[PDB]
Design a protein around this ligand. Structure first.
Ligand code: ATP
Ligand code: MG
Ligand code: MG
Lengths: 234, 232, 238, 240, 240, 192, 145, 250, 219
């Protein structure tokens, strides 16, 4: 009743990877939208007790001056991927003296997702693939770009994505409210409406966090001062 | 290549090591042996039996000299004996290189026991299947010791091992004392080996070793025949 | 069934099962076709996307100016093998200063992928590479498999629901010996359209094309400049 | 009688036994051939049978006798590949001894080194203990002829008359009956007894093309293989 | 059960089961024969065409080991290619070390030892290819050897491997190959392969022939096209 | 086919006979069988696998024989076999003969379904829990034409089960079950 | 602890074991018994005094295989030279009951192709047609103890 | 290869890990040892097990081992692992002295050995050490000290403790009768004699069946003495006569 | 003297028995192994010898034993408890064939799908004489099987059986039959009047019965 970490299924599947894929249905939901004006990212927090400090937990963390990342699923093991992306971008800047594209970062970090092994290697990662789902937003030479990564190591460019426990319902609602001539304000309003619609607890200015990035300025994170303005006029 | 790197000897729910018990059970089925010391030297007696007349009885030996004043006999598995003999020889050599003196008996016993114990905790291996008797004569007082597949050891006055060892110990209980000589020790050793011996005991079925303050040596078949006669 | 959990175990019929399951895995990808004429080699691929708001997955990769590949399977191992190919070709260009012939490269890939199918606790690579190249002897088409067993073929198609395309290619084999690129590509597209249901065919967003020629570098066409090639196709008969 | 993985690897069974080694002893009998070795007053003889079931096979390369050294000869039984590997190891070890110590290697030391090498396989739980046997013959100064035997369990010994193979028991019984008479041994007598032992155990009355004979003696210690003609000479001299 | 999962477990009756499974994997290969003449050897392989898409000359099963040595394989192609590569590297190493072309009696032995090394441990699996080595030298004549996955190599006057090995060797034995020069042997090899593998089993196939001997001054190569054309033209006459 | 045995005859198709239902515990196999038994109009002969174990030698085969005889007495009607995995796994005899008589019972059951004029107008229906231990000779089509699989409900199944099981109680007017469905990813109907 | 309906046999055996070497003695009655594998016979029945001699009947030496081939081959209308020694050399470990089969298969090969005589080639086909079918029979030899 | 493994490192569903538990069940049998201190000097008492009629009685010590100039320790359980552990900590003490030129405090040595002992219960896949043992010593930091180890890895200071098979009864009797800061090295011996009398089934307390070691302080010596068999007998008979007198009082 | 036929399940063994019984004139007895296992001691051997005695009287009769592996299980040695009644009926069967007095008038056929089980003394050359073995159908046979069992159904002229046979390898005969009834019902669901190529293509996926997972992220 014991099988190895790498073992193919009768139908063409890998066992560990399929389990990791289905194990991200336990995390918080997160929504990302891309528009020619800029990129918008939003996520919930899921506070458990009144004794929480809502400022301690965070999901959106910036990779660089123009690249931000949102994580879902488990959180303990995403730190290594984040640190790898940071170091790799800094190394490319040091060697070539420029800023590297979003797609290059995504494909450079996805190479590491499937190196788990049990024999003929150094300790590395013993078994588990990583169990996180990541959304990358940035503004490179060809405009604003959004990418979505997958625990199997597959990355693809999307236009509107929602990942987490409430993925399918949010995606179904999101398919019918999007067009290619949006502004940033209406994108933010739609994301807020969806999160209010699916979230369990009542929405306020401390249950969620949001970030936007534009070609003009760098990665900017909203605070509890301008966050209630976009809420009161919902 | 590579090994396995996980212990094959583990603890049972009742707090016992099974493999050591099975090794002792295998030891209990070996050829019998006896060992005595009395105030002047030590005597080691063992019984050997070829299956048929085709085997050459002078080609191999049971009693083996580690150095000029240490002797060793075994009971249990055959092939495992040579590995231990060779390791003991090596250890005596390193000791003599470092200290420029013949090794004391107790140190050699401790080192051999340490090796035998270490061999039951490492990975992908099984313990040895023999029990040893070691004899020596240093600084006047003779010494006798017995090892164990688990690595423990004891010091004895008289000891019987192999088949029917309980009967040998009981017999030695009512006979042995603390004041005899090597010749009487030989007589009682042959007498107690005759308890489970064959029908007719010849001068070649038995190996006898003697240690006094003159050195270890193996008795030639002639005087073994002389001792077998005029007794029993 | 205990004869199914390792690549070291031999079945009573002398058939290892992990290799068979990898061959099963490679059939889940999208279909792809490849063929060669007198002086050109052409391969065509059909893309796929999950939702209507996601870009289609990329299937054709650029290995070198005279060698191109098409993948089918899972993307991680495909990228690893593609990187190895890049490295080997560059090393050959550096040392002997000449392009590496296709046959030697395929032999190197075959020797590399065979190693994991014999050790303990190692899995094979799940990919379906089709290799198209041009060399001193002319065009070349090659096909590999997870079992480390390459084939030399003059026309092939693999992926999910590839059988009908193979039938069409087989019954139209001779006509490939004379025609030029203009209708060679049309033949490839006709073969590829056969492996779809009767609702949707080709809309310029799901089809990619790659050409290598005697005097033409390896070139990729996708979604904008495919319209010149896509026009001129008769409707699917009903 | 068994509990756990004692039937699959080399660890002690509850009674104190281990089966992964005594399975090799019956793996020996898979070849279906028998070999005999006899030692005389000043010579040693090795005899065996050979079977060529097909005409297409080249009969010149089916020998089981091997020249380990210009003075030491051997015969093998059991699986062929394992025997070839053991031959290779023995050749290398003898050459190394000659290189290191500057004089020829005794036969007993060689047998002991081989047995010590073989004993490891029945100690660790990741190898298989090589089901093939071993018989060596040689000449030693101040000792005369010597005949030694080695087995897969690591038990080597020195004999006066040996048989290895399918018919081991009754051949040893016949040899014991012959040797209890304590008669003088010369070259012709030793060869005749060795041949007749196999002849009466198998009851064949064979031809000079179905056996192989090797001999060593104190007149030219080189190990030599008898040619078919002189083999036929002994065969006809045996039948009065 | 469970005695047939590793390559390091003797069955209770005393034999290894994984190697037997490799054998059964070999017995489904197509066919390959090879016979030696007065002054060389001739190989012959029948190759099945699975579908019309493949090109002629694909996946040759007649490999060229060294400048005067040739190989013919049967089994799983990947393992066969690996064995060919290791033999080629070993031969080059020998030529570099000593200084002349390696004889067959040494190359065949080394490859056999390397193959046998993969049947003891539980961390690797046995190979699955059976192959033939052939050569000709002016100072040693013609040489032919056959090696099986269990690790056994013998010398032959003529041999066959594949599905209908015994059926092929039946008509092989009828020939008096000991006499004629291998210029007329090509016709009889073509005849002997066209008299097997009924057209009911498969529709079409093709013939691959090799050549080595004094006729080529030691080089090993494929036969000229016209000669093969004449050979198959002659062999078609078995329809009578 | 029993309700309208005229379309198939005109079209020349002979319908399948057997069917198997497998999946993890607490999924809906036995309940689906109960629904079928309620709807039908022919026989419905229920058999539990563990009833075929007997004290003496050569007994279970007999009961199988009389079972199919009584089945043939009627015109056309159904057999239900529950918990098959207790009646036969595979033939593996080794060492001392063990689990041998049950294998004879399994062989008689196999024989009654195929070979020398099969049962004719009798349809069987078996459902199991762990189908990895079933014997290959039994799973051959012609005895088990269909292999319906019951998997854990995805998302709509959970809301639908909640609606079915909570539509007969006094509850507040504004509770939303979709959130409850989202809160239990992999679960069966029994837990709901 | 065998089942009831399996102690009745063990009474029948006690009758048998008591009729021979019981309290009262046989005269001029002799007993012959045959068995396929004497591993399993009750140790009281193999005692010297009930079964006194044990006669091993064994697979044939090549000379016996020639003898048996000459027995069973005779009546066939065979034609031309025949060399039995090749057959005897190929058939190894055959039972007596297989050589009869070789002789039947040889004629079966000639009923096809409308002949009414047999030639040596037929024997050489049939030998191998039989010899490879023995692969699926177990190879154990059992011996009393 | 993963079929023959035993997995001697993983957890269990109930939270605990089995191998250390089984080792603690193994330490239950095989011997009895106890230690007590209240003033100048600390005493260890051990129950000899090998009491056959044929023993040569060498090495001047059965179960008491010397680890430094002012460190002694007993042991219970498998004896071979005891030899390993004692040899292992000896050079730990010596290397500390080599580096600092100062006698090593007891606490640091105990912690170092416990770290080595615990290393085997988290990674490596090897059978753990089935040995538990005591420590007695003196140093300028805290005077006299007694400590106890554990195959699991943890430890702790103590004032009076027992480890052998009947440790429960010994502990109960110890906590019933003890006084803090008054017991000189005259009453502690009597207390140990009475406790051993209660625990062991054999009465009359044969002097050859027990072993006593005491540690006392001198100006600069810190002498360790193993009192001979010529002084145990009168101690035992004094205990017997005073017990008989006390019982006769009632 | 007699014929055995063996091989993987689902190949045409019992179909041949039915065919032979349908063509010949002789008396045909049909039997199955498990039917001989009887509760009272000695009751089974009586049935065996009574069946041979009946066939002997009907001069040219032939007798067919199915499921032979229910009787032929290898004998063994045991000291606590074991199986014996079935062994003892087997020793009667092994004696109506061959045995002390030769019977030359009745023909015996027997069938099984596993042979590694059977007692060697039953496989002997004198009893079961020709041991035919049945292989799984190669590519060209599957076309013929499918083309037989669809003989009576109404099917359009655009079906390409040498495509269908080519993407269904590692099927046996029974599954190649079942494809045809699946392809019938698939067409019946849509009310269509005759079968068409896609109905066969879907029937393939019905009879494959592979478990489901999306695996859409591949390629
Ligand atoms: N799809 C469903 N719709 C309604 N109720 C369901 C459904 N699935 C399960 N249930 C409920 O859950 C329970 C399922 O028990 P059921 O007897 O159907 O299981 P089973 O498949 O026979 O299980 P097992 O094999 O473990 O015995 C019942 O209480 C049933 O009402
Ligand atoms: Mg149920
Ligand atoms: Mg049938």
């Amino acid at each position: 009743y014991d099988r190895g970490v790498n073992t193919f299924s009768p139908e063409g599947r890998l066992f560990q990877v399929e389990y990791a894929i289905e194990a991200i249905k336990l995390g918080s939901t997160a929504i990302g939208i891309q528009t020619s004006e800029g990129v918008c990212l939003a996520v919930e927090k899921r506070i458990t007790s009144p004794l929480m400090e809502p400022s301690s937990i965070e999901k959106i963390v910036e990779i660089d001056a123009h690249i931000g990342c949102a994580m879902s699923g488990l959180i303990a093991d995403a730190k290594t991927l984040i640190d790898k992306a940071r170091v790799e971008t800094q190394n490319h800047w040091f060697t070539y003296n420029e800023t590297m594209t979003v797609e290059s970062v995504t494909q450079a970090v996805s190479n590491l997702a499937l190196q788990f092994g049990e024999e003929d290697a150094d300790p590395g990662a013993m078994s588990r693939p990583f169990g996180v789902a990541l959304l990358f937003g940035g503004v490179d030479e060809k405009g604003p770009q959004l990418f979505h990564m997958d625990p199997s190591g597959t990355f693809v460019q999307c236009d509107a994505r929602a990942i987490g426990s409430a993925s399918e319902g949010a995606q179904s609602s999101l398919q019918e409210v999007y067009h290619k001539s949006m502004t940033l304000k209406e994108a933010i309003k739609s994301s807020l409406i969806i999160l209010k619609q699916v979230m369990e607890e009542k929405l306020n200015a401390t249950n969620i966090e949001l970030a936007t990035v534009q070609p003009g300025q760098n990665f900017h994170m909203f605070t509890k001062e301008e966050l209630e303005e976009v809420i009161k006029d919902i | 290549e590579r090994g396995y790197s996980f212990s094959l000897t583990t603890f049972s729910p009742s707090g016992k090591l099974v493999q050591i018990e099975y090794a002792l059970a295998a030891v209990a089925g070996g050829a019998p042996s006896v060992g005595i010391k009395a105030a002047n030297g030590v005597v080691l007696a063992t019984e050997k039996k070829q299956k048929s007349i085709l085997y050459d009885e002078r080609s191999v030996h049971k009693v083996e000299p580690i150095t000029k004043h240490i002797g060793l006999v075994y009971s249990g598995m055959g092939p495992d004996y040579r590995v231990l003999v060779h390791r003991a020889r090596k250890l005596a050599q390193q000791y003599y290189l470092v200290y420029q003196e013949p090794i004391p008996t107790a140190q050699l016993v401790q080192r051999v026991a340490s090796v035998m114990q270490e061999y039951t905790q490492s990975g992908g291996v099984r313990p040895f299947g023999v029990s040893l008797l070691i004899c020596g004569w240093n600084e006047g007082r003779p010494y006798l010791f017995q090892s164990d597949p688990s690595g423990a050891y004891f010091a004895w006055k008289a000891t019987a091992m192999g088949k029917n060892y309980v009967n040998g110990k009981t017999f030695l209980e009512k006979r042995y004392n603390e004041d005899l000589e090597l010749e009487d020790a030989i007589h009682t050793a042959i007498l107690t080996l005759k308890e489970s011996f064959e029908g007719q005991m010849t001068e070649d079925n038995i190996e006898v070793g003697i240690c006094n303050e003159a050195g270890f040596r193996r008795l030639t078949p002639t005087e073994v025949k002389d001792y077998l006669a005029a007794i029993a | 069934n205990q004869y199914d959990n390792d690549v070291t175990v031999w079945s009573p019929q002398g058939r290892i099962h992990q290799i068979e399951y990898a061959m099963e895995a490679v059939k889940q990808g999208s279909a792809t076709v490849g063929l060669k004429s007198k002086t050109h080699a052409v391969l065509v691929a059909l893309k796929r996307a999950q939702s209507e708001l996601a870009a289609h997955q990329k299937k054709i990769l650029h290995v070198d100016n005279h060698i191109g590949i098409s993948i089918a399977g899972l993307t991680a191992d495909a990228r690893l093998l593609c990187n190895f190919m890049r490295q080997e070709c560059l090393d050959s260009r550096f040392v002997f200063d000449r392009p590496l012939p296709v046959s030697r490269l395929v032999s190197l890939i075959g020797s590399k992928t065979q190693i994991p199918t014999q050790r303990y606790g190692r899995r094979p690579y799940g990919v379906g590479l089709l290799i198209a190249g041009y060399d001193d002897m002319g065009p070349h088409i090659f096909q590999t498999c997870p079992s480390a067993n390459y084939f030399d073929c003059r026309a092939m198609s693999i992926g999910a629901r590839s059988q009908s395309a193979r039938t069409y290619l087989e019954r139209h084999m001779s006509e490939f010996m004379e025609c030029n690129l203009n209708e060679l590509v049309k033949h490839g597209l006709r073969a590829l359209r056969e492996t779809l249901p009767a609702e949707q065919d080709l809309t310029t967003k799901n089809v990619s094309i790659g050409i290598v020629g005697k005097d033409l570098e390896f070139t990729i066409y996708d979604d904008d400049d495919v319209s010149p090639f896509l026009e001129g196709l008769e409707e699917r008969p009903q | 009688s068994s509990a756990g993985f004692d039937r699959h690897i080399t660890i002690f069974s509850p009674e104190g036994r281990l089966y992964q080694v005594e399975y090799a002893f019956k793996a020996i009998n898979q070849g279906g051939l028998t070999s005999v070795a006899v030692r005389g007053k000043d010579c040693a003889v090795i005899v065996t049978q050979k079977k060529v079931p097909d005409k297409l096979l080249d009969s010149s390369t089916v020998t089981h006798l091997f020249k380990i050294t210009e003075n030491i000869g051997c015969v093998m039984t059991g699986m062929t590949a394992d025997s070839r590997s053991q031959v290779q190891r023995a050749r290398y070890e003898a050459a190394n001894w000659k290189y290191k110590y500057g004089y020829e290697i005794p036969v007993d030391m060689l047998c002991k080194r081989i047995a010590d090498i073989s004993q490891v396989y029945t100690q660790n739980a990741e190898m298989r203990p090589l089901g093939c046997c071993m018989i060596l013959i040689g000449i030693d100064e101040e000792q005369g002829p010597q005949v030694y035997k080695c087995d897969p369990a690591g038990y080597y010994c020195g004999f006066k008359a040996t048989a290895a193979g399918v018919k081991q028991t009754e051949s040893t019984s016949f040899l014991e009956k012959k040797v209890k008479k304590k008669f003088d041994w010369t070259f012709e007598q030793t060869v005749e007894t060795a041949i007749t032992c196999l002849s009466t155990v198998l009851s064949i009355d064979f031809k000079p093309s179905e056996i192989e004979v090797g001999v060593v003696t104190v007149e030219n210690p080189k190990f030599r293989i008898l040619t078919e003609a002189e083999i036929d000479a002994h065969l006809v001299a045996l039948a009065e | 059960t469970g005695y047939d999962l590793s390559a390091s477990t003797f069955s209770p009756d005393g034999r290894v089961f994984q190697v037997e499974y490799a054998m059964k994997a070999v017995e489904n290969s197509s066919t390959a024969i090879g016979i030696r003449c007065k002054d060389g050897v001739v190989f012959g392989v029948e190759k099945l065409v699975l579908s019309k898409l493949y090109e002629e000359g694909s996946n040759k099963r007649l490999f060229n080991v060294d400048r005067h040595v040739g190989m013919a394989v049967a089994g799983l192609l990947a393992d066969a290619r690996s064995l060919a590569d290791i033999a080629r590297e070993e031969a080059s190493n020998f030529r570099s070390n000593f200084g002349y072309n390696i004889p067959l009696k040494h190359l065949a032995d080394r490859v056999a030892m390397y193959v046998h090394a993969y049947t003891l441990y539980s961390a690797v699996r046995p190979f699955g290819c059976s192959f033939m080595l052939g050569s000709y030298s002016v100072n040693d004549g013609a040489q032919l050897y056959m090696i099986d996955p269990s690790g056994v190599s013998y010398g032959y006057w003529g041999c066959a491997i594949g599905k209908a090995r015994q059926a092929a060797k039946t008509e092989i034995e009828k020939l008096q190959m000991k006499e004629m020069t291998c210029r007329d042997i090509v016709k009889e090899v073509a005849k002997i392969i066209y008299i097997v593998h009924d057209e009911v089993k498969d529709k079409a196939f093709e013939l691959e022939l090799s050549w080595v001997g004094e006729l080529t001054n030691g080089r090993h190569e494929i036969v000229p096209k016209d000669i093969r054309e004449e050979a198959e033209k002659y062999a078609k006459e078995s329809l009578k | 086919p029993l309700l309208h045995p005229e379309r198939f005859v005109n079209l020349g198709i002979e319908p399948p006979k057997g069917v198997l239902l497998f999946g993890p515990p607490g999924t809906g196999k036995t309940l689906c069988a109960r629904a079928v038994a309620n709807r039908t109009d022919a026989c419905f002969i229920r058999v539990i696998g563990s009833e075929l174990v007997q004290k003496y030698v050569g007994e279970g085969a007999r009961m199988v024989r009389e079972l199919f005889e009584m089945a043939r007495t009627k015109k056309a009607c159904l057999i239900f076999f529950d918990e098959i995995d207790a009646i036969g796994g595979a033939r593996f005899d080794d060492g001392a003969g063990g689990d041998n008589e049950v294998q004879r019972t399994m062989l008689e059951l196999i024989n009654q379904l195929d070979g020398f004029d099969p049962r004719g107008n009798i349809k069987v229906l078996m459902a199991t829990n762990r189908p990895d231990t079933l014997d290959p000779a039994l799973m051959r089509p012609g005895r088990l034409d269909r292999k319906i699989e019951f998997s854990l409900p995805d998302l709509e199944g959970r809301t639908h089960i909640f609606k079915i099981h909570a539509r007969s109680m006094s509850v507040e007017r504004d509770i939303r079950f979709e959130l409850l469905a989202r809160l239990c990813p992999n679960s069966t109907g029994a837990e709901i | 602890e065998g089942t009831s309906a399996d102690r009745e046999i063990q009474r029948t055996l006690m009758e048998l074991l008591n009729q021979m070497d019981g309290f009262d003695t046989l005269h001029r009655v002799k007993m012959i018994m045959a068995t396929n594998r004497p591993d399993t016979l009750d140790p009281a029945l193999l005692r010297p005094g009930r079964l006194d001699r044990k006669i091993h009947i064994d697979l044939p030496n090549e000379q016996a295989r020639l003898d048996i081939l000459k027995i069973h081959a005779g009546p066939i209308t065979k034609h031309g030279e025949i060399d039995y020694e090749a057959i005897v050399k190929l058939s190894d470990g055959f039972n007596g009951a297989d050589l009869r089969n070789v002789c039947t298969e040889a004629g079966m090969f000639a009923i096809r192709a409308d002949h009414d005589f047999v030639v040596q080639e037929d024997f050489m086909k049939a030998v191998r047609k039989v010899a490879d079918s023995k692969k699926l029979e177990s190879k154990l030899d059992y011996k009393p103890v | 290869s993963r079929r023959y493994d035993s997995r001697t490192t993983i957890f269990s569903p109930e939270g605990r890990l089995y191998q250390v538990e089984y080792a603690m069940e193994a330490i239950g049998h095989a011997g009895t040892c106890l230690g007590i201190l209240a003033n100048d000097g600390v005493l260890l008492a051990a129950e000899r097990r090998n009491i056959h009629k044929l023993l040569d009685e060498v090495f001047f010590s059965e179960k008491i081992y010397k680890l430094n100039e002012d460190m002694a320790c007993s042991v219970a359980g498998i004896t071979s692992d005891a030899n390993v552990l004692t040899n292992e900590l000896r050079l730990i003490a010596q290397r500390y002295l080599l580096q600092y030129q100062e006698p090593i405090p007891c606490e640091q040595l105990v912690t170092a050995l416990c770290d080595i002992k615990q290393a085997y219960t988290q990674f490596g896949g090897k059978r753990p050490f089935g040995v538990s043992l005591l420590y007695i010593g003196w140093d300028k930091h805290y005077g006299f000290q007694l400590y106890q180890s554990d195959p699991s890895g943890n430890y702790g200071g103590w004032k009076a403790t027992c480890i052998g098979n009947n440790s429960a009864a010994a502990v109960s009797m110890l906590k019933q009768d003890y006084k803090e800061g008054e017991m000189t090295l005259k009453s502690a011996l009597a207390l140990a004699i009475k406790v051993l009398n209660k625990t062991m089934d054999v009465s009359k307390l044969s002097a050859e069946k027990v072993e006593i070691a005491t540690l006392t302080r001198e100006n600069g010596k810190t002498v360790i003495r193993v009192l001979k068999q010529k002084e145990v007998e009168q101690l035992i008979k004094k205990h017997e006569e005073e017990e008989a007198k006390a019982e006769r009082e009632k | 003297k007699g014929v055995l036929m063996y091989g993987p399940p689902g190949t045409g063994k019992t179909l041949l028995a039915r065919a032979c019984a349908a063509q010949t004139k002789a008396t045909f007895l049909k039997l199955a192994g498990p039917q001989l296992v009887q509760m009272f001691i000695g009751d089974g051997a009586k049935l065996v010898r009574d069946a041979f005695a009946l066939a002997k009287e009907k001069a040219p009769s032939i007798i067919f034993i199915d499921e032979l592996d229910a009787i032929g299980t290898k004998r063994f040695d045991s000291e606590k408890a074991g199986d014996r009644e079935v062994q003892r009926t087997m020793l009667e069967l092994l004696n109506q064939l061959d045995g002390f007095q030769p019977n030359t008038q009745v023909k015996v056929i027997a069938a099984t799908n596993r042979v590694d089980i059977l007692d060697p003394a039953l496989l002997r050359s004198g009893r079961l004489d020709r041991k035919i073995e049945f292989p799984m159908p190669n590519e060209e046979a599957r076309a013929r099987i499918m083309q037989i069992h669809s003989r009576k159904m109404n099917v359009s002229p655009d079906v390409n059986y040498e495509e269908l046979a080519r993407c269904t390898d590692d099927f046996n005969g029974a599954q190649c039959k079942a494809v045809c009834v699946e392809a019938g019902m698939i067409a019946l669901r849509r009310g269509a009047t005759e079968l068409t190529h896609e109905d066969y293509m879907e029937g393939i996926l019905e009879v494959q019965a592979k478990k489901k997972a999306n695996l859409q992220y591949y390629a």
